[PDB]
Amino acid sequence: NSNICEVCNKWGRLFCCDTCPRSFHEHCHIPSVEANKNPWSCIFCRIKTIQERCPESQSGHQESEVLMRQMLPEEQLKCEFLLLKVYCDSKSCFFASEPYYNREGSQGPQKPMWLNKVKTSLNEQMYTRVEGFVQDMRLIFHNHKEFYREDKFTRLGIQVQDIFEKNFRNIFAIQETS
Ligand SMILES: [Zn+2]
Ligand SMILES: [Zn+2]
Ligand SMILES: [Zn+2]
């Protein structure tokens, strides 16, 4: 197995996947690495299994159909994996914890949002459809773009949104378009 966390790329107290060489800090894996379970399979492996069981799940889908899906166990897992893929980028640090807003010429957003809040919301089964999860994720980046206006720091929101959107299209097998 790897000797660094797949998510944050640091060593430490690591839990090793039994079916692939990845390793994880306890609270870097989503969901948090389970207490017992021998063997244990990581989220990457669990997602691969879904695909392998239903090859047709990789045919193209419309975004509007995906968003309306209820959060049954497979869709719960897919959103946990998509959230984890965002944390995998180091620029997620900017969006992880609760933001505050005090900048001359700007007003903070009406509905602040951050990654750890989405993480808690998934853990607590607060989303009933994929749409709820995707709306809160996109809100993170939209709040950032609006607040930072023409400061070059706005780009960090474009960058992490692009990681989110690419991973959304991959995980949920969104139909490719030009
Ligand atoms: Zn880690
Ligand atoms: Zn694995
Ligand atoms: Zn099938």
Side-chain angles (χ1 to χ4, degrees), residues 1-36 38-178:
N1 289 64
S2 183
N3 311 327
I4 56 173
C5 181
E6 185 75 354
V7 185
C8 71
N9 301 105
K10 298 291 195 277
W11 181 72
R13 185 52 195 110
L14 300 173
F15 302 85
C16 289
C17 182
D18 291 311
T19 51
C20 82
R22 300 178 173 90
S23 310
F24 306 82
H25 298 105
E26 179 163 14
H27 300 304
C28 284
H29 196 271
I30 306 179
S32 291
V33 167
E34 299 73 15
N36 204 286
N38 322 54
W40 181 72
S41 273
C42 76
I43 185 157
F44 294 78
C45 285
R46 296 167 70 187
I47 290 285
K48 187 198 298 303
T49 294
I50 303 314
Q51 289 167 11
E52 287 179 346
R53 288 178 161 159
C54 283
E56 75 278 18
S57 70
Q58 305 162 281
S59 296
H61 301 78
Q62 299 294 110
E63 180 173 313
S64 60
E65 178 269 320
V66 167
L67 296 181
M68 294 302 314
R69 301 181 189 164
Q70 300 178 10
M71 290 281 258
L72 297 182
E74 292 188 352
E75 302 315 308
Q76 177 78 33
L77 195 72
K78 285 178 163 209
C79 292
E80 287 167 345
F81 187 49
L82 177 48
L83 179 58
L84 176 137
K85 282 297 191 146
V86 172
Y87 280 107
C88 288
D89 198 281
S90 62
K91 295 163 176 285
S92 70
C93 71
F94 297 110
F95 296 106
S97 69
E98 185 172 4
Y100 61 86
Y101 298 94
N102 195 5
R103 182 196 182 237
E104 175 177 346
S106 292
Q107 267 296 327
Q110 307 293 315
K111 184 180 170 184
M113 195 48 63
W114 59 102
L115 303 168
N116 297 345
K117 182 173 173 52
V118 179
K119 186 181 278 202
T120 292
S121 296
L122 274 174
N123 174 239
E124 292 182 9
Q125 304 161 297
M126 302 281 289
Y127 300 111
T128 59
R129 289 171 197 272
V130 174
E131 182 178 46
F133 167 82
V134 173
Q135 286 173 340
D136 275 354
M137 295 291 287
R138 287 174 167 166
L139 181 66
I140 299 169
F141 316 114
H142 193 259
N143 283 351
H144 177 97
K145 288 167 64 178
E146 295 304 298
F147 182 72
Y148 293 103
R149 309 285 202 107
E150 312 306 286
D151 194 295
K152 68 193 171 167
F153 189 61
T154 61
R155 184 159 167 266
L156 272 293
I158 295 169
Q159 294 176 322
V160 181
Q161 181 148 23
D162 193 48
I163 300 291
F164 175 69
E165 296 298 340
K166 286 183 190 274
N167 281 280
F168 174 69
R169 288 190 305 269
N170 176 264
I171 293 165
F172 288 93
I174 297 296
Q175 177 61 46
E176 289 278 285
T177 57
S178 51

